[PDB]
Design an enzyme around this catalytic site. Structure first.
Site, PDB file in Angstrom:
ATOM      1  N   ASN A  10       0.852  -1.183   0.000  1.00 31.71           N
ATOM      2  CA  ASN A  10       0.000   0.000   0.000  1.00 31.71           C
ATOM      3  C   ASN A  10       0.892   1.239   0.000  1.00 31.71           C
ATOM      4  OD1 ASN A  10      -1.893   2.002   0.404  1.00 31.71           O
ATOM      5  ND2 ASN A  10      -2.453   1.322   2.473  1.00 31.71           N
ATOM      6  N   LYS A  12      -0.010   4.258  -0.136  1.00 30.72           N
ATOM      7  CA  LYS A  12      -0.687   5.369   0.549  1.00 30.72           C
ATOM      8  C   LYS A  12      -0.603   6.628  -0.322  1.00 30.72           C
ATOM      9  CE  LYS A  12      -0.215   3.133   5.037  1.00 30.72           C
ATOM     10  NZ  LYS A  12      -0.029   3.361   6.499  1.00 30.72           N
ATOM     11  N   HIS A  96      -9.457   0.469   4.852  1.00 27.02           N
ATOM     12  CA  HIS A  96      -8.184   0.725   5.506  1.00 27.02           C
ATOM     13  C   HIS A  96      -8.398   1.556   6.766  1.00 27.02           C
ATOM     14  CE1 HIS A  96      -4.110   2.163   6.240  1.00 27.02           C
ATOM     15  NE2 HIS A  96      -3.746   1.081   5.576  1.00 27.02           N
ATOM     16  N   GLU A  98      -6.946   4.012   8.039  1.00 22.89           N
ATOM     17  CA  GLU A  98      -6.898   5.464   7.895  1.00 22.89           C
ATOM     18  C   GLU A  98      -8.216   6.014   7.373  1.00 22.89           C
ATOM     19  OE1 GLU A  98      -3.383   5.434   5.463  1.00 22.89           O
ATOM     20  OE2 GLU A  98      -2.180   4.904   7.230  1.00 22.89           O
ATOM     21  N   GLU A 166      -5.111  -5.086  10.718  1.00 20.37           N
ATOM     22  CA  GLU A 166      -4.206  -3.985  11.032  1.00 20.37           C
ATOM     23  C   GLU A 166      -4.159  -3.773  12.537  1.00 20.37           C
ATOM     24  OE1 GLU A 166      -6.418  -1.245   8.029  1.00 20.37           O
ATOM     25  OE2 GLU A 166      -4.397  -0.447   8.370  1.00 20.37           O
ATOM     26  N   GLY A 172       2.410   3.588  15.541  1.00 13.28           N
ATOM     27  CA  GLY A 172       2.603   4.952  15.996  1.00 13.28           C
ATOM     28  C   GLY A 172       2.224   5.229  17.430  1.00 13.28           C
ATOM     29  N   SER A 212       3.591  -3.497  11.165  1.00 22.37           N
ATOM     30  CA  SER A 212       4.942  -3.218  10.692  1.00 22.37           C
ATOM     31  C   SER A 212       5.638  -4.523  10.321  1.00 22.37           C
ATOM     32  CB  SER A 212       5.718  -2.492  11.788  1.00 22.37           C
ATOM     33  OG  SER A 212       7.082  -2.335  11.439  1.00 22.37           O
TER      34      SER A 212
END
Ligand code: NA
Ligand code: NA
Lengths: 251, 251
Positions: A10, A12, A96, A98, A166, A172, A212
């Site tokens: 991806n 992004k 996704h 996000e 995910e 983060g 990750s």
């Protein structure tokens, strides 16, 4: 038959024409496991879909990062599934993290998108995953099951679906997810599919890990019983993506 | 100096490669008023931006239908302003009524997008407009002023802005907007700009009409004192768009 390992990249909201040409050339020169061992999908921004599809090696496949929920028309700024089919783009990423969080896509909206994309002939990487607050509240499987159920209620054929988990809680936040933690979620999600859809769908649907992924964990993750591959983020822009594809090989 | 008439064509979520080639060829063969008389912008879906930019006559300009609110990165499915600049796409439509209503874009979100796009060098068609319920409540100018203020608070240079007024109340509702009703809103909006920004900005900023535009009303609308052109919807896909451009001519 064993589920075929699956590696998606991806990109992004990244890319220029010059960088995309470099990325594609590096992919075209890559030497990776056979098509019998691994299925590779790369996902550029909409504006680069024709360029990538026209220039990428024919044994790697192209995905859009999103599409609209229904037939096109008066939806300024959106790209319909039938547009992607017209451009010979075979895959789409839907739901996704996000888009769920930043663009406020609801679980039902994502489910409707999956159903419409499948109906138009697209193959779908359908994404689910829980936040740190959800995990720490004890709600990991409550959340993942609810997101998956909204999709499952609208899907009659799972052949062209890959699920991506995910671990948003470990993206983060200062927490590092272990391969064992990934396996736990993937196992519980597959068990949910077996009970709520069918044993056959559970046994045949790829569930890929969207946390990750790098050289320090790719073999460890890929070798887990219920992890069938990866949805890669930033490394997908880089030569490191090739080494992740190579993790599909178990000699 | 008189404001240059402006005609934008918003293709919305429509198009196939074959249709886009036909549309572009028809535009390329068109014979319209001079560049001193009219500025023409056409707005395809993201996936067709490179194709249209590469093949369209150099005196017509290309716009994206949307862009992201800030620098790119981890925003799956979004297209950044800097991507558009990289692809030599000079214009973007922001705040279209369909994105405000269906995709829930707030007035502040739209304002932030306008500011970021302008900062990256794009030219912006910034859209405002009230619904039927808002109009019938007596809130037309309250709504339009509030939408415009959220943009104005974030804009220091209006040179590269065109405002489009969309009479959402008269789009798919059974109400027909008259040229006089368009002029009333455009006049009040320009007066608002004069008081809240400056007399110079009010006098120089194009305010284009984004309602239904066709052969029965284009000369009547275009000749109104405060109407500086059109943001066309469905006719933008058709040869009828050329006759709308021709309404810029007052012999
Ligand atoms: Na595995
Ligand atoms: Na006029």
């Amino acid at each position: 038959m064993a589920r075929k390992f699956f590696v998606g990249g991806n990109w992004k909201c990244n890319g220029t024409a010059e960088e995309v040409k470099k990325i594609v050339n590096t992919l075209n020169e890559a030497q990776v496991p056979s098509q019998d061992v691994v299925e590779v999908v790369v996902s550029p921004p909409y504006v680069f879909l024709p360029l990538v599809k026209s220039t990428l090696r024919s044994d790697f496949f192209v995905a859009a990062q999103n599409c609209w929920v229904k037939k096109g028309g008066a939806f300024t700024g959106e790209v319909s599934a039938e547009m992607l089919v017209n451009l010979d783009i075979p895959w789409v990423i839907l739901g996704h993290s996000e888009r769920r969080a930043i663009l406020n896509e609801s679980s039902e909206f994502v489910g409707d998108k999956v159903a419409y994309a499948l109906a138009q002939g697209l193959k779908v990487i359908a994404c689910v995953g829980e936040t740190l607050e959800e995990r720490e509240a004890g709600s990991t499987m409550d959340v993942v099951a609810a997101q998956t159920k909204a999709i499952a209620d609208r899907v009659t054929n799972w052949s062209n679906v890959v699920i991506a988990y995910e671990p948003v809680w470990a993206i983060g936040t200062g927490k590092v997810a272990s391969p064992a933690q990934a396996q736990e979620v993937h196992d519980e999600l597959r068990k949910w599919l077996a009970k709520n859809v069918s044993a056959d769908v559970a046994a045949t649907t790829r569930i890929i890990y969207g946390g990750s992924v790098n050289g320090g964990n790719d073999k460890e993750l890929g070798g887990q019983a219920d992890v069938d591959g990866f949805l890669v983020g930033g490394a997908s822009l880089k030569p490191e993506f090739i080494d992740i594809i190579k993790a599909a090989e178990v000699k």
